[PDB]
Amino acid sequence: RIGKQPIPVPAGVDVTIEGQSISVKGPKGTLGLTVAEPIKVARNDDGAIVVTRPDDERRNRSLHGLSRTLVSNLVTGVTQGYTTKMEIFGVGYRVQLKGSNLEFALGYSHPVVIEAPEGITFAVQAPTKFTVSGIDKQKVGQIAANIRRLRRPDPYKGKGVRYEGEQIRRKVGK
Template sequence: MSRIGRHPITVPSGVEVDIDGREVTVKGPKGTLSHTIAEPIEVQMEDGTLTVTRPNDINKVRGLHGLTRTLINNMVVGVTDGYKKTLVIQGVGYRVVAKGQNLEFSLGYSHTITVEPPEGISFTVERPTQLVVEGIDKQKVGEVAANIRKLRKPDPYKGKGVRYEGEYVRRKVGKAGK
C-alpha cells in the first residue's frame, strides 16, 4: 500500500462528507469543496473516518491512491481551517493597496497592476509591503499567490520583488568594477 494512502482521514465534528458515486463533497464551516475520484480508486466512510483503497499494485494506481487521499485530506482541512499564503514586497516604491476587493500593485513599472480575486479567494493587506491570500482550496490559494509573485519575481542582485514569507532569495555578487 501507499504510505500516504494507507492513513485514514479523520473527519472532525462540524464537517459533513458526502460520497455520491465518484464525487466526494466536503461541507464545513468555511464552505463546500468537491472532487471527482479517478476510476480504480475507492473511498469509504466508516465511523467518522474516510478510507481510500485501491484494487491492485500497478504503479499508476499506487500514485493515484496517495494523491486522492491527500486531495481529500486537503479538502477537509480547507473547509475547517482554510489555507493562507503571505507575500512580502521588497523594493523602493514597491507597494500594494487594497481597492475594495481588488489589489493595486506598484512594482516599478510605468503603470499600476490591478489583480481581482477569483471566487473563493480573499486578499488582506496587512502593510503596504505585505499581503495575505486566503481561501479554502489549497490549490487555488497557491496558484493565485504564485501568479502575484510572477508579477515581479525577486531580483537575485538587489532582492527587489514579490516573494513568499520565509522564502530565501539567493543573492548574486555584481560585477567587479576596475
C-alpha cells in the first residue's frame, strides 16, 4: 500500500537523479543513494519524487516500498537531523566529553572512549543523560548498538542505557 505514497520535496536544493542514483541537498550536508535498477524512478510535475514498479515478482514490491522509505529517509534526514536519546539508570557514572568524543564509566576500569565516526553530533543533556544525532539512521544507530551488551543491562537492578522505555524487566526479589 506504500506504492500509493509520493514523497514531497520541501527543500529540493539539489535533489536529483544521476543515472539511477539520487543526490540530495537541503539545510544539512549532502547525501547520495544508489537506486535499484529494476525500479523506475521519476520526478513529478510538482517536484515530488515518484518511485514505481508493478509486481508479479514480490521483490519488485519490496524494492518499491523499501525505496520509498529510503528516499523519505534522505529527505527527512537532510531537512531534519535524526537523533537518539540515551538515559542512564545506574550508580557511579558521569557522562564525560573530553576532546570531541564520549567517555563512559560505570563500575569497571578503563573507561570506554567511543571512537566517534565522521559526520555525527554527540550531545550531553545531563551527567546521566546524553543524546546523539546525525543525517543517517544507519550511522547513528550503529553507535547505538556498539554500546549495549558490553556489560549487559541486568534486568534486576539496572546499570545502563534505555531508549526511553523498552519495558525493561525487573528483578523478582532475591
